[PDB]
Amino acid sequence: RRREECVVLPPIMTVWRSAFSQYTKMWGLTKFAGDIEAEREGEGPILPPI
Amino acid sequence: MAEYLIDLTPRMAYVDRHELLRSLLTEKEFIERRQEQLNKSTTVYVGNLSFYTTEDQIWEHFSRCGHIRDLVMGLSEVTRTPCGFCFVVFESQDGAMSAVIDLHGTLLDDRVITVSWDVGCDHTRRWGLVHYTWIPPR
Amino acid sequence: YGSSEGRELDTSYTPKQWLWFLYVTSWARPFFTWGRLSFDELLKLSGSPIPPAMVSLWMGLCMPTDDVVQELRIIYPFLPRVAESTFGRALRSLAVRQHISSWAALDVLVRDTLEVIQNSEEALEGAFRSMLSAPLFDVKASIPEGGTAQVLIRVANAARLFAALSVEAFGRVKSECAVLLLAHINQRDAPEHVDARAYGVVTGVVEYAMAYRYCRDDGTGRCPLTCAALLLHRLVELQGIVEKDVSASRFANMTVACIQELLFCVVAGDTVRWHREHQPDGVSVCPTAARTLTLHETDCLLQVFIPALLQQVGFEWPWSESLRHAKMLDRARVMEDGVRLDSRSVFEELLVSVARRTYGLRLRAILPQSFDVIAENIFSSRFALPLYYRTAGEVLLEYFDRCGPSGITAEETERVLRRATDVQPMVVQLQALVYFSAREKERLLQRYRCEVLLASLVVYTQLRTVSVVQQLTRQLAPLFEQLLLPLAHERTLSRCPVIALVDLTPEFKMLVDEIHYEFYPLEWVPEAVDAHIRQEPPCFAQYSLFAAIAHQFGLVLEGNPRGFRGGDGSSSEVRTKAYRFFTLMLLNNLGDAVSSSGASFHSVVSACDVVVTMTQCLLPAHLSSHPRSMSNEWMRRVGEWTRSAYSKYTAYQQQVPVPLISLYNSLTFDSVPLARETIRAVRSRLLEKMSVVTASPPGDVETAGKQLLEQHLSSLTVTLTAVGLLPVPCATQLLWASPFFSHELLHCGRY
Numbered sequence A: 001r002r003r004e005e006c007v008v009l010p011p012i013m014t015v016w017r018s019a020f021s022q023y024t025k026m027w028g029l030t031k032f033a034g035d036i037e038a039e040r041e042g043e044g045p046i047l048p049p050i
Numbered sequence B: 001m002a003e004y005l006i007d008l009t010p011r012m013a014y015v016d017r018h019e020l021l022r023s024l025l026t027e028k029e030f031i032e033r034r035q036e037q038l039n040k041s042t043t044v045y046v047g048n049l050s051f052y053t054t055e056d057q058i059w060e061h062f063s064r065c066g067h068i069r070d071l072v073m074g075l076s077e078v079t080r081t082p083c084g085f086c087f088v089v090f091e092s093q094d095g096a097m098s099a100v101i102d103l104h105g106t107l108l109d110d111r112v113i114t115v116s117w118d119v120g121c122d123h124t125r126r127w128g129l130v131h132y133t134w135i136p137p138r
Numbered sequence C: 001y002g003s004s005e006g007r008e009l010d011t012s013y014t015p016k017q018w019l020w021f022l023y024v025t026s027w028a029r030p031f032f033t034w035g036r037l038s039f040d041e042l043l044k045l046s047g048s049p050i051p052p053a054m055v056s057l058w059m060g061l062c063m064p065t066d067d068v069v070q071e072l073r074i075i076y077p078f079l080p081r082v083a084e085s086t087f088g089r090a091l092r093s094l095a096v097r098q099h100i101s102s103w104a105a106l107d108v109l110v111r112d113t114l115e116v117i118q119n120s121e122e123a124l125e126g127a128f129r130s131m132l133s134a135p136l137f138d139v140k141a142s143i144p145e146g147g148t149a150q151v152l153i154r155v156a157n158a159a160r161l162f163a164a165l166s167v168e169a170f171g172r173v174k175s176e177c178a179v180l181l182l183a184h185i186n187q188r189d190a191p192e193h194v195d196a197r198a199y200g201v202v203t204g205v206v207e208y209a210m211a212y213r214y215c216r217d218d219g220t221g222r223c224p225l226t227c228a229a230l231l232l233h234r235l236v237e238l239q240g241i242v243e244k245d246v247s248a249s250r251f252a253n254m255t256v257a258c259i260q261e262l263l264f265c266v267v268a269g270d271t272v273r274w275h276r277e278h279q280p281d282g283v284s285v286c287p288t289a290a291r292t293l294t295l296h297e298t299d300c301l302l303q304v305f306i307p308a309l310l311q312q313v314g315f316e317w318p319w320s321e322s323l324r325h326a327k328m329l330d331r332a333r334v335m336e337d338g339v340r341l342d343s344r345s346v347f348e349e350l351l352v353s354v355a356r357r358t359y360g361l362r363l364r365a366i367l368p369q370s371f372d373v374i375a376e377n378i379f380s381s382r383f384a385l386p387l388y389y390r391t392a393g394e395v396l397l398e399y400f401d402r403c404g405p406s407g408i409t410a411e412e413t414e415r416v417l418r419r420a421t422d423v424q425p426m427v428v429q430l431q432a433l434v435y436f437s438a439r440e441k442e443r444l445l446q447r448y449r450c451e452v453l454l455a456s457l458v459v460y461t462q463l464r465t466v467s468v469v470q471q472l473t474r475q476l477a478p479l480f481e482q483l484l485l486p487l488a489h490e491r492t493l494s495r496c497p498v499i500a501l502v503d504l505t506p507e508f509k510m511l512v513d514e515i516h517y518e519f520y521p522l523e524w525v526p527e528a529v530d531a532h533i534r535q536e537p538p539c540f541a542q543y544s545l546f547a548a549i550a551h552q553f554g555l556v557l558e559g560n561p562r563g564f565r566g567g568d569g570s571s572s573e574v575r576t577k578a579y580r581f582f583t584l585m586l587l588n589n590l591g592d593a594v595s596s597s598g599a600s601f602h603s604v605v606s607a608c609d610v611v612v613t614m615t616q617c618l619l620p621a622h623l624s625s626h627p628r629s630m631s632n633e634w635m636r637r638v639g640e641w642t643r644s645a646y647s648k649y650t651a652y653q654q655q656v657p658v659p660l661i662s663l664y665n666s667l668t669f670d671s672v673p674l675a676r677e678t679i680r681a682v683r684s685r686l687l688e689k690m691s692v693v694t695a696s697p698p699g700d701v702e703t704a705g706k707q708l709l710e711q712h713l714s715s716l717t718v719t720l721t722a723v724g725l726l727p728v729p730c731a732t733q734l735l736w737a738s739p740f741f742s743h744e745l746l747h748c749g750r751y
């Protein structure tokens, strides 16, 4: 019942997540090595959009 | 603009039983009488705010429209906790106009809010987890 | 129509109602690829950029067959709630004149608008520069677009003037401004022209917002930067609806790239052309900054614009990538007022501004593990009685807890306050007691009582709920006004507590040592420093209740050891407390209504009070913290600090058009963004209250309020000069030398 569990992000957000992905994909943006190393579910949880 | 969209005129769609209890027609009485009140109102109903949204979050968002004379949080009568909505009384109608235009359908606390135009708040209207133990139950 | 419960559609318009419809729509015509065609029909010739659902009634209206509008053009009214530029008003006027004569168009309106200003494409660029001037230097450069792109330069150079004019005219209605910007962007001239138009629109909106917040006074209390952020989010949302019928994702990409370019220019401190050197193919438009960022623009982005946008997008951003590349830009090596801030500082400021709109858990979840240092830096936090006012404020707290803010009354609070102070030993000593005039003793006792009252208020409320804070300040405003009536704009002590081998005045020494009376350092430290400089009443000397309470609560704000490149040198607890105080207890109580439910305000907080409270909070912690006899130790501390600061100042003076980073800096206002934010918001709030007071029906109480507000404005300019913000060194030149902020206030055109 944590405050993040009750967060549902607006449907416009799929456009912004895609825009972030496209911005990082070009211009050569790479996450931090430790942040990439968060393959054991240690990375940033992302709120579900509807 | 605002000289082209006359929707800028404050209009409140729903009707309420206290207005119903006042013996007036829903035309030329409650609806017409409210227009003179709304046409000078500096107050807005926010709507869809979360239960855990704090007054600081509502203030931080609505203060960019204008000075907030008074910010009243809806409160469930049984528990005196925020029940989902709010009432933001500004100092000028410029702020209330900005709040209804700019802040309607705008993400406040991971919730899309429904900023509208109201006539004015009263302790009675404020009713309908920060426990507002300082507000006298009524 | 207006003042009606139902909206009526448009009808036949008189030539008056036409001049206005044309004034607020005719300019938009030349920016699209014929007179006598309504805007929906003129957009059909532009590929119908907007679907029928988004078109508005005004776009339906067609042109009338009136020749009266021909002859009445031979001065136009003023648009409500905006500070129109001299170019924008001229452009809209010549738009109506040239739309009537209509019954290459854009190039002639801009050339003819410029001649009007400067009498008695460079043109489409000088147009944007003239719009954002009280000349503006463009933050984002259009010439960086590719090879063989003079056409694309013009398309964006016109989207910047179009966005500027569209926020100037359609801004109050965000939905309509967003639909007019989408219509401009989504023209079907060429697919490559859409990206240039989007870049121009986004850069123009951002630059207009930042220039409007710097040199434009409209007295509305509506933040231009939050409006710009919401407008850019509305643009993306409305392109999403047009797409569900180029892409909403593409516009969102330019918006991000433009923010990231500004961030990287701030971190790098120079035009690194980061996106230009990282171009995927070259044909795509890549936002580049034409110059570094002034401190005002950096404060705009890191305190208002980017936090508001992020709140709109759920606080999601390319966080890990941006931090990495900012860190690379840190290890590197111009404009006089340009600023460089370290990545730690930039992202610390961004996240502390962001954290006010959310809670710690959301930012913890969103931010990657590379922000753990930042998160710990941005996250003892309570207000506690300072052991001065402790035993006197305990009784007041017991009363407040028993009754609550709803039941708190001014007269019962006064009774409890006198009942609690008079018992306390310091009050008995002062009352019982080398020479103390009765005026001085009542001054010193009323000052203590008011300080106890305010400290009890701050501790009880914790400054966490604006409603409780405002209600309690409203209830106790008569009490505060009565208690500060003797104090006012007067020093508590009859004579300056510093004389002459420079020492403190004997009665001041007596109060500090024998009686244990605490004066906040701003009362005497600057005069002590000026005496020590001489060795080799001032506005801040006058009493401020909030300066005393700030000093007692230990609200010490300073710079970073790294220098100007840092800035957020302050504990998280102290910075959170100083925000909740300089924003609720001071800024939201300045010109605040006497009662709950305009133009009727209680004078508990004054503008000079806010300025001097900031200056007290920015005093060096060495000179502000009490030692552990006490007076002479404090004075010796002041003397050694003054010697060190004089040596530093002389070093800087011989070390020297001249960049502000190369001038002497006290790391007080140029370091703490809360200082600059509060100083600007003081004048903004005063002008907004002026507008509300003038809007109220004419009378006598309104006239008194208007005189009080102009007195507040004049006092604000004087208190700022007292600090040194509006100008052998002087004490103010050594304690609060802030060349960047001083340059902004000396060129903002608001003082």
Ligand SMILES: CN1CN([C@@H]2O[C@H](COP(=O)(O)O)[C@@H](O)[C@H]2O)c2nc(N)[nH]c(=O)c21
Binding pocket: B012, B014, B016, B044, B045, B074, B083, B085, B116, B117, B118, B119, B124, B125, B126, B127, B128
């Ligand atoms: C849905 N509501 C609810 N509301 C106000 O909220 C108060 C409490 O409503 P609930 O009992 O539904 O929570 C009422 O007194 C009513 O006036 C509203 N006030 C205005 N102006 N506009 C609206 O759309 C609404």
